Amino acid sequence: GKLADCSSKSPEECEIFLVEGDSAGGSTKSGRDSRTQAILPLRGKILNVEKARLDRILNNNEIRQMITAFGTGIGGDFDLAKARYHKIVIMTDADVDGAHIRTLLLTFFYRFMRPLIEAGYVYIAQPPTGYKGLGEMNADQLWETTMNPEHRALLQVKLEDAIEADQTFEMLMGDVVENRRQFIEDNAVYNERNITSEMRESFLDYAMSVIVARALPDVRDGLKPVHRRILYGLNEQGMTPDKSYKKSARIVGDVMGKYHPHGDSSIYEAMVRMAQDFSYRYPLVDGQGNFGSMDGDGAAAMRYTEARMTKITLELLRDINKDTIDFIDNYDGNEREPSVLPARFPNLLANGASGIAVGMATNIPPHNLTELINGVLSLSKNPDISIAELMEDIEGPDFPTAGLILGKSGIRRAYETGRGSIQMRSRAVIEERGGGRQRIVVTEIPFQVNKARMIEKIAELVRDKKIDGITDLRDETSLRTGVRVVIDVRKDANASVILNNLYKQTPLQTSFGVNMIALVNGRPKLINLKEALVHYLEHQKTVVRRRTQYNLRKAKDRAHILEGLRIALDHIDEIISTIRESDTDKVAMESLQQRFKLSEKQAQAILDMRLRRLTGLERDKIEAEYNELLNYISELETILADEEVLLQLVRDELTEIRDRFGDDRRTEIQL
Amino acid sequence: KLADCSSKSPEECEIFLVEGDSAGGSTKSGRDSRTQAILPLRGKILNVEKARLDRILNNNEIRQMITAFGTGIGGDFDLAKARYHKIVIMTDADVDGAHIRTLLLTFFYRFMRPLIEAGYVYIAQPPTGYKGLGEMNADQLWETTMNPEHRALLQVKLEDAIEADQTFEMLMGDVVENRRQFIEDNAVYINERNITSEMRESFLDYAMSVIVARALPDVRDGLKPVHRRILYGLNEQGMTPDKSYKKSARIVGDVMGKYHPHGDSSIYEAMVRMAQDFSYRYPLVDGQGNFGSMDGDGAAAMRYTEARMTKITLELLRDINKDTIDFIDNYDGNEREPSVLPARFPNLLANGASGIAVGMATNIPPHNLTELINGVLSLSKNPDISIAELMEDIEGPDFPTAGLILGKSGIRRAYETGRGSIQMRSRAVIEERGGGRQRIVVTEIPFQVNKARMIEKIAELVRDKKIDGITDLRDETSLRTGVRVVIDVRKDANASVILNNLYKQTPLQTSFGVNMIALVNGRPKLINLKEALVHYLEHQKTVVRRRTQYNLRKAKDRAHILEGLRIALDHIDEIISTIRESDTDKVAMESLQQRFKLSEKQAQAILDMRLRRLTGLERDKIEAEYNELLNYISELETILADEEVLLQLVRDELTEIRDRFGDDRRTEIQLG
DNA sequence: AGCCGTAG
DNA sequence: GTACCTACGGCT
DNA sequence: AGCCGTAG
DNA sequence: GTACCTACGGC
Ligand SMILES: O=c1ccc2ccc(F)c3c2n1C[C@H]3CN1CCC(NCc2cc3c(nn2)OCCO3)CC1
Ligand SMILES: Cc1sc(-c2ccccc2Cl)cc1C(=O)N[C@@H](CN)c1ccccc1
Ligand SMILES: Cc1sc(-c2ccccc2Cl)cc1C(=O)N[C@@H](CN)c1ccccc1
Ligand SMILES: [Mn+2]
Ligand SMILES: [Mn+2]
Ligand code: NA
Structure with a gap:
């Protein structure tokens, strides 16, 4: 019910944008091409499914809304052919919490909707450097810089090594604190994207920020x-x-x-x-x-x-x-x-x-x-x-x-x-x-x-x-x-x-x-x-x-x-x-x-x-x-x-x- | 939301009705918890004069007050069951506080009139200069308004029931013209309070402020x-x-x-x-x-x-x-x-x-x-x-x-x-x-x-x-x-x-x-x-x-x-x-x-x-x-x-x- | 009806 | 006017 | 197991 | 991060 769909019913040309909240969602809805582009606003930080019990995951409202929107179902019943959008775009704020929310979303896609990534359906948007959050952008500027197929730069998420990716989600998002701490200490410092690289860099970005500036x-x-x-x-x-x-x-x-x-x-x-x-x-x-x-x-x-x-x-x-x-x-x-x-x-x-x-x-x-x-x-x-x-x-x-x-x-x-x-x-x-x-x-x-x-x-x-x-x-x-x-x-x-x-x-x-x-x-x-x-x-x-x-x-x-x-x-x-x-x-x-x-x-x-x-x-x-x-x-x-x-x-x-x-x-x- | 007092003896217990949680916390801290209960409200309250019974009964604020008082309402009202012998209205000393007060008295007059007749209903008088009860420290709230030693409370008094019926109808009823005529006619630039007077003055204050300053x-x-x-x-x-x-x-x-x-x-x-x-x-x-x-x-x-x-x-x-x-x-x-x-x-x-x-x-x-x-x-x-x-x-x-x-x-x-x-x-x-x-x-x-x-x-x-x-x-x-x-x-x-x-x-x-x-x-x-x-x-x-x-x-x-x-x-x-x-x-x-x-x-x-x-x-x-x-x-x-x-x-x-x-x-x- | 727009 | 959802770590 | 306190 | 109460008058 929070979803603002596109009129086209042909998934092959349809794109769904995932944004942080209504602040971003409204700029997004005004600036988009309603014919092919849908917007689903989320509600800030979403459930980390790597740490949650399965019944909790299934009962979480934000998670359900995505599943219903994508239309493919989850886990065993996942059906790629039933996808309602061939492009699922993560458009969080260009800041450290924006990064965290992205690691949380990828983690959900990876554990529960993996074929989606394998199919090459998952992308990451790239909003401009200057703004506070997407809520701070005028609809027209958000359109030209980020959502316009003519000028936008999207990253497609590519899954390369699946052993390596399992080890990665477990390490970063899992419930063992020490391995995550070690990963951060080791790496801390002052259009196709490998999913492992994206998680490592986005998570380190968030983690570092919380330690030194929060x-x-x-x-x-x-x-x-x-x-x-x-x-x-x-x-x-x-x-x-x-x-x-x-x-x-x-x-x-x-x-x-x-x-x-x-x-x-x-x-x-x-x-x-x-x-x-x-x-x-x-x-x-x-x-x-x-x-x-x-x-x-x-x-x-x-x-x-x-x-x-x-x-x-x-x-x-x-x-x-x-x-x-x-x-x-x-x-x-x-x-x-x-x-x-x-x-x-x-x-x-x-x-x-x-x-x-x-x-x-x-x-x-x-x-x-x-x-x-x-x-x-x-x-x-x-x-x-x-x-x-x-x-x-x-x-x-x-x-x-x-x-x-x-x-x-x-x-x-x-x-x-x-x-x-x-x-x-x-x-x-x-x-x-x-x-x-x-x-x-x-x-x-x-x-x-x-x-x-x-x-x-x-x-x-x-x-x-x-x-x-x-x-x-x-x-x-x-x-x-x-x-x-x-x-x-x-x-x-x-x-x-x-x-x-x-x-x-x-x-x-x-x-x-x-x-x-x-x-x-x-x-x-x-x-x-x-x-x-x-x-x-x-x-x-x-x-x-x-x-x-x-x-x-x-x-x-x-x-x-x-x-x-x-x-x-x-x-x-x-x-x-x-x-x-x-x-x-x-x-x-x-x-x-x-x-x-x-x-x-x-x-x-x-x-x-x-x-x-x-x-x-x-x-x-x-x-x-x-x-x-x-x-x-x-x-x-x-x-x-x-x-x-x-x-x-x-x-x-x-x-x-x-x-x-x-x-x-x-x-x-x-x- | 009710913070009740210790004593079980209503004769000595008081309940204070406050505007929101902002005043509630200072009130909770400053009060004598042995005899003073606190019920925070949620801003403007239902006007029962304009509402049908199904909506009244299903309103959470009205329900909390009914539950807290223990008397029941209207025909089933029982003065003996009252859990407090002082029900004290304590809104902010501003125009919207005055409005809340008319709304509360409207509910009391319509559903719990013996409570007013008995003399159980009062109005607190916090000091001005504050812009909110949330603004006062707890000790100030106690000394000026809740301490029985220094407080000045107005006891609400029902003198003429015919006149009060008419006043509640005119001020709070559904006919806009009579209420407008009242405001036009009256607008201009020691412990007891007649209810009709309180309603006319508190309502006029609010109505005029909204017309000229809002x-x-x-x-x-x-x-x-x-x-x-x-x-x-x-x-x-x-x-x-x-x-x-x-x-x-x-x-x-x-x-x-x-x-x-x-x-x-x-x-x-x-x-x-x-x-x-x-x-x-x-x-x-x-x-x-x-x-x-x-x-x-x-x-x-x-x-x-x-x-x-x-x-x-x-x-x-x-x-x-x-x-x-x-x-x-x-x-x-x-x-x-x-x-x-x-x-x-x-x-x-x-x-x-x-x-x-x-x-x-x-x-x-x-x-x-x-x-x-x-x-x-x-x-x-x-x-x-x-x-x-x-x-x-x-x-x-x-x-x-x-x-x-x-x-x-x-x-x-x-x-x-x-x-x-x-x-x-x-x-x-x-x-x-x-x-x-x-x-x-x-x-x-x-x-x-x-x-x-x-x-x-x-x-x-x-x-x-x-x-x-x-x-x-x-x-x-x-x-x-x-x-x-x-x-x-x-x-x-x-x-x-x-x-x-x-x-x-x-x-x-x-x-x-x-x-x-x-x-x-x-x-x-x-x-x-x-x-x-x-x-x-x-x-x-x-x-x-x-x-x-x-x-x-x-x-x-x-x-x-x-x-x-x-x-x-x-x-x-x-x-x-x-x-x-x-x-x-x-x-x-x-x-x-x-x-x-x-x-x-x-x-x-x-x-x-x-x-x-x-x-x-x-x-x-x-x-x-x-x-x-x-x-x-x-x-x-x-x-x-x-x-x-x-x-x-x-x-x-x-x-x-x-x-x-x-x-x-x-x-x-x-x-x- | 339920909306409009300043208020709690 | 007000009430909850989420991440994150460590301690019970 | 739910709480502590900055965050979305 | 978000949703839903209240007053008030006129159509
Ligand atoms: O009680 C509830 C209950 C449910 C609910 C649901 C959805 C929902 F949105 C909300 C809900 N609420 C409350 C409300 C959430 N609030 C958070 C605080 C926010 N304050 C803005 C603000 C003020 C400022 C300022 N900056 N920002 O700068 C300095 C001057 O004052 C306003 C929205
Ligand atoms: C998680 C991070 S980030 C970081 C770092 C490094 C370089 C620049 C900026 C930053 Cl922020 C260091 C560590 C870390 O764990 N340090 C170790 C020292 N043994 C430790 C272990 C346990 C407790 C405290 C500290
Ligand atoms: C409700 C009030 S208050 C007020 C007043 C009086 C004196 C000082 C301060 C104030 Cl605010 C006047 C009226 C009023 O109704 N005026 C009449 C015009 N005679 C009217 C009738 C219909 C429409 C608009 C105006
Ligand atoms: Mn942000
Ligand atoms: Mn006030
Ligand atoms: Na029409």
């Missing part, structure tokens, strides 16, 4: 691109804590247009989590309005909420405009965006990260800011510090939701190797409720556990009689009292046994599996605690050194200008005479340069000077600024002359941040 | 608030035709934050229509990407499309920064927006308008711009011109979709009175297809007719055997050929007969019901063709008059500065020494003013002068500017001194616009 944080600032773009967007709009909140829909529309060419919900939902004090150990966004709850209620629609940077986020963006980090071109070349943030606090470890990539994933727990900075300071004084010594500063993860960690052994393994299992428990106590009866009271729950869902789980166990001795279950949580979950215990039953059982059978006890993978030098890397801290500290040294160099050039440039102004003030009569005698700006400029040994920049500055600069207060200000400047330049040079002084400055600034933003440990690590 | 165009620029805000948003962001396309998501978020506090889809779809050349006779938006089709395909998601002003839209905004129109504060006081656009072409008539309001609706067809401007010119030369004479310029509507209008008699009635029915017919011809067989070919369809859907209607008629003689039906439309819909006719059947039947039984012939209502001085008004031209010409006289006055004010301000600069350069050594000798800015200003007879503004301008202005070509170059200004000042004064000269200037600027943007008529008017 799902993994950078080790230096702890951010993924969508977060870095959000925060940079708030900086560039002047959405500072002192400044008022800006509506979220404007922030999101802004980020979308300038830096992040993806769907609005991905951006808004990333921003929302950054504002949740139950998600971020040190929240990066300050939100006004409904930003979700521990119960998994979603945030209010973006038209209603407002947001701005938290104060600690200013520390992430500090000195970004002092040539501290490298800018790069944005997605369409009309803007510039930061490659990384200055990150004056160790954000990766402080807020942690979780991302599902391709071939790999990352799980990094959050940490206490005071402990992390103290760890960085200990490292700065001792490059050969061991993990055990570092743990004297950093006890373990510190969750925003507090709770308990059981033992140091999982933490120790994770810090040493980057992988460990950490056991988390809710904070629970047994107390009397009167009448000789007792209750269990939970005041803190494990990190990332949905409270309401945890309670549902307990209720279901009680209902199914899978747990004994619970008379009542209520959520007494309130803004005023904090989290409070009350489990009433049957009189004379052992509450401690019931609690132990709750730990065994519900998320009241949950584990955090540490998998510390981050982008180091543009590549994913499993890193230990020390390595994550070493990368953070080198970054801070580079940022501070660069800021100091930038500030020196700027101060020197400004001093240069002020010397010219001071010269002008010393010979103001002569300066005025020279300018009056000149016919043009260009002559005056040359004459000032010749007569007073001034640079072009100095002369330009003098010619720009307003007459009010001539008053007593203004002359003094020019002289006062120059004298202030000379001292500043001397201070900057001192820092750059001595690596130790530079390093000390890094330590001092970290320390300042520690004292301003460092807070108490929340999570209790129990021996 | 669904009806201004007679002066032909726009509704959302369209005006979009265009002003484009001008402000500098999205002119010379600049590159801006992404739609960014344009929309900007309009949302700054001027239009409503949904993104309302803004984006309004912008998309301005871009469609099958909708707008002179498109106001230049769109890049998928902007929808005549088959009712919607535009691509806003993440993909880009947009900017068309060239003609520059004429809507021309002179906006010369104090030609009044600006007003935006919705939250942080911005300024235009009350109306200068509108240098008659956009109301040119592009037409359709809007469903409350108590009334509007339907104004588009027109040919060359014709309209000629009409305005003729009118400007003769205030007593008649409609018939005006029709010598303005033949009738001119649809972007072309086609035919049958006869001039509906056009005439609509122009004379503002109401008329106009028959639009497709352009269709009969031609041979070979073998002695024929086809009907359609290349133009009526305005606002979905082509795919019209084709479906035809296919339906053929399959149901309600029409004889059709053997095939195809849409051969393409970019190369334009609309082409082909109906094959059975050999030896009369094709003209088949075509006449298709006109009678399908949208291939359709009617446009003209009902020209626009806002005139802030009030809706049914207007005829001449009255719409008159208000337009007045607006233009006013814009040009104000523009001239602004320019004159500006030019004198400038001449004044230059007289100070002339004096400064003539005495420059003494000027500089005066400044050098002054300790501060203030002292220099006083000294310059006393010594050289300079105003405060002249002296500031002298102190702001850069040294590079002392170069040679300046004494004369300043004198060059000063000389042109005097001439210009004289030119502006002449215009303000003679109405006829001002009127001629309006005529001239309209004529230039007609020659630059005026195009050929598309819709053919056949007599008859």
Whole structure:
């Protein structure tokens, strides 16, 4: 019913185009030749049939619609002669997700409709380079470039080696992660088409993009691109804590247009989590309005909420405009965006990260800011510090939701190797409720556990009689009292046994599996605690050194200008005479340069000077600024002359941040 | 969706009805969960006053409320079974919140009246300034509206049941005229609440806002608030035709934050229509990407499309920064927006308008711009011109979709009175297809007719055997050929007969019901063709008059500065020494003013002068500017001194616009 | 009828 | 006004 | 086995 | 990635 067929009933001259969604589909339908060309719009990512059970595959709506459209049936019953189109054309967006969707479609054609490929019926379209998605093209341009048999370039998909192609679909699309990961590491780098070559190149294109530009944080600032773009967007709009909140829909529309060419919900939902004090150990966004709850209620629609940077986020963006980090071109070349943030606090470890990539994933727990900075300071004084010594500063993860960690052994393994299992428990106590009866009271729950869902789980166990001795279950949580979950215990039953059982059978006890993978030098890397801290500290040294160099050039440039102004003030009569005698700006400029040994920049500055600069207060200000400047330049040079002084400055600034933003440990690590 | 409280004891339990999930989550968090339950609604609710019982009972929102209350409904209503003794209506403090409140009270009065009689129904009073309950933090919601310690609730009271019956009937019933009369009669520019009063005030607030601030165009620029805000948003962001396309998501978020506090889809779809050349006779938006089709395909998601002003839209905004129109504060006081656009072409008539309001609706067809401007010119030369004479310029509507209008008699009635029915017919011809067989070919369809859907209607008629003689039906439309819909006719059947039947039984012939209502001085008004031209010409006289006055004010301000600069350069050594000798800015200003007879503004301008202005070509170059200004000042004064000269200037600027943007008529008017 | 177009 | 489909990895 | 979070 | 509720007035 989503299919827009062509009028001809002769398959030999008929072509069906497969496109990503209705955005693309509408340009496609308007621009086509309705006589011979059909359009079937799909719905974004389609089922990977290499990983799915067969009944699921047969019951999936997108899959059925293709089968019905092609008309050949599937597997054993496939009948090539019954095909309704001799050309099946894959026309996804010319981007990395476009590529993924193509690997998913080919995988379906190969496993289920193979003769179709063998017959040479499957092609790949080749839309132009410039556009965002096909939804961004005018129908006429899409017709000429991509669908016009006269000018289009199609690739026909050719099946050459079928042993090789089976091995290929299994490797890329199959359920064994390791083989796929190996394939990516090995190949990762910075009109007839063999189906194996198309899968390998298209999948690597997608997989690479997800690893380096989506799902993994950078080790230096702890951010993924969508977060870095959000925060940079708030900086560039002047959405500072002192400044008022800006509506979220404007922030999101802004980020979308300038830096992040993806769907609005991905951006808004990333921003929302950054504002949740139950998600971020040190929240990066300050939100006004409904930003979700521990119960998994979603945030209010973006038209209603407002947001701005938290104060600690200013520390992430500090000195970004002092040539501290490298800018790069944005997605369409009309803007510039930061490659990384200055990150004056160790954000990766402080807020942690979780991302599902391709071939790999990352799980990094959050940490206490005071402990992390103290760890960085200990490292700065001792490059050969061991993990055990570092743990004297950093006890373990510190969750925003507090709770308990059981033992140091999982933490120790994770810090040493980057992988460990950490056991988390809710904070629970047994107390009397009167009448000789007792209750269990939970005041803190494990990190990332949905409270309401945890309670549902307990209720279901009680209902199914899978747990004994619970008379009542209520959520007494309130803004005023904090989290409070009350489990009433049957009189004379052992509450401690019931609690132990709750730990065994519900998320009241949950584990955090540490998998510390981050982008180091543009590549994913499993890193230990020390390595994550070493990368953070080198970054801070580079940022501070660069800021100091930038500030020196700027101060020197400004001093240069002020010397010219001071010269002008010393010979103001002569300066005025020279300018009056000149016919043009260009002559005056040359004459000032010749007569007073001034640079072009100095002369330009003098010619720009307003007459009010001539008053007593203004002359003094020019002289006062120059004298202030000379001292500043001397201070900057001192820092750059001595690596130790530079390093000390890094330590001092970290320390300042520690004292301003460092807070108490929340999570209790129990021996 | 219900988030219930702990207590089982209704006497102390309260249920809060909120607009959506946006307010629901803050409400869930902020409430006392022991005694406060939350039921989020799904925006506007069924009006039970206009609906039959089967539809009422099958509505999910009505069902959830019935289920939650526990009382049952109507005849089976049981007050004792109520699960809460306080049912609290908590919508946003805005016009649409007020509407939701009338809809809820309508359901309660009709299906659960004892609940009101018992005193169980209340209205919360959240604070204003928020633009949504989703906007408030949970602690603010609790303290201001849900905490029993600080909250102010209105208990709804039923005093006169006869009067309330009548009020619910008039405000919410199916008779539009009584409701329209109520709005016309009442419209104008400590813990208990009478239900009749609450209904009359809440409904009037909503109805008036929709009439004056949503669904009806201004007679002066032909726009509704959302369209005006979009265009002003484009001008402000500098999205002119010379600049590159801006992404739609960014344009929309900007309009949302700054001027239009409503949904993104309302803004984006309004912008998309301005871009469609099958909708707008002179498109106001230049769109890049998928902007929808005549088959009712919607535009691509806003993440993909880009947009900017068309060239003609520059004429809507021309002179906006010369104090030609009044600006007003935006919705939250942080911005300024235009009350109306200068509108240098008659956009109301040119592009037409359709809007469903409350108590009334509007339907104004588009027109040919060359014709309209000629009409305005003729009118400007003769205030007593008649409609018939005006029709010598303005033949009738001119649809972007072309086609035919049958006869001039509906056009005439609509122009004379503002109401008329106009028959639009497709352009269709009969031609041979070979073998002695024929086809009907359609290349133009009526305005606002979905082509795919019209084709479906035809296919339906053929399959149901309600029409004889059709053997095939195809849409051969393409970019190369334009609309082409082909109906094959059975050999030896009369094709003209088949075509006449298709006109009678399908949208291939359709009617446009003209009902020209626009806002005139802030009030809706049914207007005829001449009255719409008159208000337009007045607006233009006013814009040009104000523009001239602004320019004159500006030019004198400038001449004044230059007289100070002339004096400064003539005495420059003494000027500089005066400044050098002054300790501060203030002292220099006083000294310059006393010594050289300079105003405060002249002296500031002298102190702001850069040294590079002392170069040679300046004494004369300043004198060059000063000389042109005097001439210009004289030119502006002449215009303000003679109405006829001002009127001629309006005529001239309209004529230039007609020659630059005026195009050929598309819709053919056949007599008859 | 169910559409048209700004709203929740 | 709102609700689900899909990919992807690892842990239970 | 369903969840975590950026994506279509 | 997409689909389907509601108000409102007139034909
Ligand atoms: O609830 C439901 C339930 C079902 C359903 C089905 C199909 C279907 F399409 C949808 C459904 N829905 C909701 C709806 C899906 N939504 C996703 C979000 C999208 N938002 C656009 C947007 C706004 C912006 C912006 N960019 N883009 O830039 C900044 C300003 O605001 C609008 C469509
Ligand atoms: C999947 C990819 S892509 C990539 C790469 C290479 C070069 C340029 C750009 C990129 Cl993106 C490297 C790997 C990879 O697996 N690296 C190994 C290191 N042993 C590994 C194994 C396990 C965990 C993390 C890392
Ligand atoms: C419904 C409203 S509100 C309003 C009004 C009054 C005063 C201030 C602000 C406002 Cl908005 C006037 C009417 C109305 O019906 N006007 C009559 C013309 N007398 C009408 C009748 C039929 C068609 C159009 C217009
Ligand atoms: Mn894409
Ligand atoms: Mn509202
Ligand atoms: Na008809």
